[PDB]
Design a protein around this ligand. Structure first.
Ligand SMILES: Cc1cc(Nc2ncc(Cl)c(N)n2)c(OC(C)C)cc1C1CCN([C@@H]2O[C@H](C(=O)O)[C@@H](O)[C@H](O)[C@H]2O)CC1
Ligand SMILES: Cc1cc(Nc2ncc(Cl)c(N)n2)c(OC(C)C)cc1C1CCN([C@@H]2O[C@H](C(=O)O)[C@@H](O)[C@H](O)[C@H]2O)CC1
Lengths: 591, 591
């Protein structure tokens, strides 16, 4: 349930298992021949962390269907068995099965969230045979959703990168440990010098022991102390965490023979009318929808590209993005804390719409998305994911909002009844009672979108001037203004979380045509002109930040080319257009 | 002196320090204000491992001159202070100064080789302030060499990527530990089923204790045992490590309360006449000169790209490369062991030639390279580097040769006397008495090159058809045949370690011109035609494997575009040409 980011501490170690592991593709007979017990014969090499799909040649590898086997030797000195020994998987994509010496010791469904397992019982003095098996199959029971029509069929527009996506490490704790930590903030904005009070709450598991919780500022000075599993601080004249201007207090929580620190930023999130308020000021989202996508790591974690992406944002004068379409690495989340970037944390819930791909049929009847017997089997797991996500990222001052799903069939029979339990579960599990949304596919209207009722903020993905209307930007404008005007009638805040136009870097014309850099700039001029007409529009997020990989098809020119930047982060012409527009537009008070 | 690759073992831990550190650029007043004692004020973020030059925007960052400061908190639990606690720096570029709490505890000159420091004495229960400062200045006393004409002036054709290039980890050992391990092999090739005997030799530092050394095969079976600091095995019907067909025995060396394993491949390297023999067969080098260069890591380690590079080689039917122009990561070296790739391990000794850049002058007299007062001050350090390199990579069955320097002024007054001490030091420190070379700049002839005497193999970097003769490939051919014919008269083996032609991916013509993909293919046709005429040519290595970054100048179209592949590893047309040529050409017996 609870998952704190493993770091180095006086009481806990951190042994990164990253490196070149042994690796074999399953042929079917894999589990039969109990490969997890023996070391893999005729093996292959494969770095961890990383998606495996692009690190070898040939379609047989990129396009593989099913299971892969990672192996490796691990060994701990007996002098460390005094502590409890846990194996944390930052993320395995999609389904993981972890053996040790040949004995299944764990299982996890869910390809983008961490999960751990205790090792004490199964550790065997000497070198041990660690085998993690990974499965890439997606169907109507996975999140993201795999379609219908031996090969996967992603019901989503990005490539099915699989393998050990994020790092596999080992850490330890004294057998009575800190397990969760929760921290909230009530900020008093009436004062001339605003001050605030932090509510904490530590959870443990000989659980009776002293509970020290000290508070430092970013320089390192100590400022307060308190005792108890729950407690309080009264930071006066507090330094508010702000977008593009972060401040991180530190929180050293001593308890028994265990210490853990947690950066924390003080800020307030509140909707009010047509105004998305951060620290009781009216925000405007400037930014993009992103992917964890790079060459050749695939979806694998890339701490260098994370910092380079953030550099480019601060260069472009952006302030937000959205973890389309799955939670990002803990490391990227921590970085947004230090760097001051507003994030829209979003679940793996993409592809629950079921009209894509010309749809699937049953008895000559086209299935509806939320059909009880033939449609998405994903609410059980969709709920697990809301739980794991918020348990992980609850404390991140950068997360100002939750995205329950991306482009679900939210205007359909069965939709409201699928999402209500999920929103409720989100607004009840988030200690900071943060706004909740979902990203509405093209086609929905204010009248028909089950998001008009459940959502604190309306998030549209619209393509007026690309799929709908292009190349006639004038007509497309009238379309966008008409629909946008309608959404105004809800009185809620509206933002675009996705708009864009495929552009192959290099293609130009003085009089533009689709796919050229000139057309891409003109498309954003038209859209943005209309955005600026309506004071309830509180955010623009382009799709996408950068070119990224997709399953092949006629519509996809060697991937999705809707990026403002090429896949190696080099600016298309539109990147300068946006950088100039965002420069003349503030974080606060644009309305 | 001795540096074994830190791994996970029953007796030793491995705590990778990689992550986002604190980071500030020096302004001059850095050391004055003793920033290493306090935590950095107004800091910045920076992933480690990685060059910092490309991870922020603006020339002030990319082009910075001088010092940078990395900071970070480290903390060990007192229950681990029983063992000795060492901080290993895989590589800092160029000069590192390591503080702890404010007390200089280490220093290293040398930007591409590992170096460690014991922490027990300076560790202070609690969180500690680890500050590594890094310096990028190059001049006549550094390897590589920095030129003359506040900015660096690389006397080499690649970008001055600096910062913490390879990972910083922490490992431990029992206070009497294994420190080095050496292993050689005499192979008996007379038998029908060749067998061999391995000579080992362990070094330690209560040094009196038992010495167990067990031998396993790759599957994991144990095959032998022996006791003693020195000893022997008699692997019968042995499995010879071969190029593109690796086999790795494992060697578990128990000694006191310490275990360490070391993969090892059995093979023989021997020159004989005009024939470079691996396992007493006549090899032909197929491959390229490489860089540790990727976006945006710079020179920083990239285990995903390492595996992807090796995939591409096996796709192209290559078998070798050369660590131009500095030693690569230990991880890449280990990988070549498992993958079966022949490496030419090479020192940081590039830019000792001093005729580049129009040269530097003194009293109206142009300085010669090896002038005793005004020229290269680098033999002291050049010798350290030969030592560190061979102490690190001595056991790697993939290293079949040593490159002392790249394009030194080897036909000049003073040259022979500079290199003789260095070769000798190389042929005496390498337990396997492996061939030694240096890469000869254009201009040298057999008669004039001090490499004709010192070197077991002649390695030419020639550009007939690019800088010299291009665009007239016919004339250039006559030039190449004439010079090449000459080198034949030494009776030694000759190989080209560098040839190539800048090619901007995308530029084409039916009737080619320079910089097009068609010209690049034609240039290699001409060169290779002449190579194939001479049976003493035993290797072709293209320059370069992939496009890489350089200091700016008119001659460098957004970097060095001589790659067979673009900087993101995508094939230029020549890559298919080579893949087809190398397919019809074996590892052995091409002559
Ligand atoms: C092109 C299309 C059309 C329709 N409608 C429709 N199609 C064909 C015909 Cl003949 C017809 N009459 N109508 C449509 O809705 C129907 C099918 C339910 C959906 C969408 C795409 C699905 C994915 N998106 C979002 O934008 C990104 C991108 O496309 O680049 C994705 O990468 C990203 O995940 C995603 O967030 C945009 C629309
Ligand atoms: C172009 C040149 C010319 C001369 N000679 C000369 N220049 C101008 C004039 Cl007017 C003149 N009459 N003669 C020369 O030798 C003299 C200067 C000592 C050296 C070289 C380059 C130095 C670097 N190399 C190697 O190839 C790679 C690459 O160039 O791409 C590098 O990246 C790589 O490090 C390196 O291994 C090739 C030659």
């Amino acid at each position: 349930n609870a998952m704190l980011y493993p770091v180095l501490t006086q009481s806990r170690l951190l042994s990164d298992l990253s490196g070149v592991w042994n690796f074999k593709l399953d042929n079917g007979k894999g589990f039969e021949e109990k490969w997890y017990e023996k070391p893999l014969k005729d093996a292959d090499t494969m770095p961890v962390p990383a998606s495996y799909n692009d690190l070898k040649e040939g379609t047989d590898f990129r396009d593989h269907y099913g299971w892969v086997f990672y192996q490796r030797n691990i060994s701990v000195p007996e002098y460390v068995k005094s502590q409890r020994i846990v194996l944390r998987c930052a993320a395995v994509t999609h389904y993981a099965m972890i053996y040790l010496n040949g004995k299944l010791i764990c299982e996890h469904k869910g390809g983008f969230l961490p999960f751990e397992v205790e090792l004490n019982d199964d550790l065997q003095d000497g070198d041990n045979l660690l085998t993690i098996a990974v499965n890439n199959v997606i169907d109507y029971t996975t999140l993201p959703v795999g379609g219908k029509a031996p090969q996967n069929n992603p019901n989503f527009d990005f490539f099915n990168y699989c393998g050990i996506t994020r790092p596999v490490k080992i850490y330890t704790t004294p057998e009575t440990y800190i397990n969760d930590i929760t921290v909230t903030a009530d900020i008093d904005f009436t004062k001339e010098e605003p001050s605030a009070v932090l509510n904490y709450n530590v959870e443990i598991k000989y659980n009776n022991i002293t509970c020290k919780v000290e508070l430092f500022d970013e320089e390192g000075t100590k400022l307060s102390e308190t005792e108890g599993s729950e407690g309080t601080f009264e930071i006066s004249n507090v330094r508010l965490w702000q977008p593009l201007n972060a401040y991180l207090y530190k929180i050293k929580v001593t308890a028994g023979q265990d210490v853990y620190t947690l950066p924390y930023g003080v800020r307030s999130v509140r909707v009010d009318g047509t105004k998305f308020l951060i620290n009781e000021k009216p925000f405007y989202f400037k930014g993009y929808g992103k992917h964890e996508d790079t060459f050749p790591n695939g979806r694998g974690i890339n701490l260098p590209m994370n910092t380079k992406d953030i550099s480019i944002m601060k260069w472009q004068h952006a302030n937000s993005f959205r973890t389309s379409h799955y939670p990002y690495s803990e490391e990227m989340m921590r970085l947004c804390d230090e760097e001051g970037i507003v994030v829209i944390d979003e679940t793996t819930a993409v592809g629950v719409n079921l009209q894509f791909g010309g749809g699937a049929n049953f008895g000559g009847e086209r299935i509806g998305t939320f059909d009880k017997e033939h449609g998405v089997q994903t609410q059980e797991h969709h709920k697990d994911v809301i739980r794991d996500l918020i348990s992980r990222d609850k404390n991140h001052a950068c997360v100002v909002m939750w995205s329950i799903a991306n482009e679900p069939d939210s205007a359909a029979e069965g939709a409201y009844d699928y999402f209500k339990p999920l929103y409720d579960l989100a607004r009840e599990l988030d200690p900071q009672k943060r706004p909740c949304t979902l990203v509405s596919v093209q086609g929905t209207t204010a009248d028909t979108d089950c998001s008009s009722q459940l959502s604190d903020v309306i998030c549209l993905n619209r393509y007026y001037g690309w799929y709908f209307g292009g190349p006639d930007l004038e007509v497309s404008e009238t379309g966008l203004r008409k629909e946008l005007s309608d959404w105004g009638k809800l009185g809620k805040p509206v933002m675009f979380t996705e708009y864009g136009a495929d552009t192959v870097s290099g293609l130009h014309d003085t009089t533009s045509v689709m796919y050229t850099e000139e057309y891409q700039v003109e498309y954003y001029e038209m859209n943005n002109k209309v955005f600026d007409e309506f004071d309830f529009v509180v955010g623009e997020q382009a799709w996408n930040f950068a070119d990224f990989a997709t399953s092949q098809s006629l519509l996809r020119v060697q991937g999705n080319k809707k990026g403002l930047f090429t896949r190696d982060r080099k600016p298309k012409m539109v990147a300068h257009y946006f950088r100039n527009r965002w420069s003349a537009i503030p974080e606060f008070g644009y309305k």
